[PDB]
Write a protein that binds this DNA or RNA. Structure first.
Length: 36
DNA sequence: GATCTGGCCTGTCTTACACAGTGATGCAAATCAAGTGTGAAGCCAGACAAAAACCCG
């Protein structure tokens, strides 16, 4: 388990309740993990 | 005597005679680890209907 490991799923529902899909949901989550 | 020649001595020159196998490093490629809802390949439904292999009048 790494940062993105426990960051792609722990914050997954925060976009999965908006994005039905499951790449596009965590996609912008990767961008907000990269910005920081 | 004088020389010839033949035998022995080295002296070079030819082919040959044992290296891939050890443990280590160090990069490139693969995988894999989650996320989450998908569809796809079969599963099996008791019972029914078109073909290969061989019996049969």
């Amino acid at each position: 388990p790494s940062a993105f490991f426990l960051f792609c799923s722990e914050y997954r529902p925060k976009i999965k309740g908006e994005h039905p899909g499951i790449g596009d949901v965590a996609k912008k989550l990767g961008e907000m993990w990269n910005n920081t």
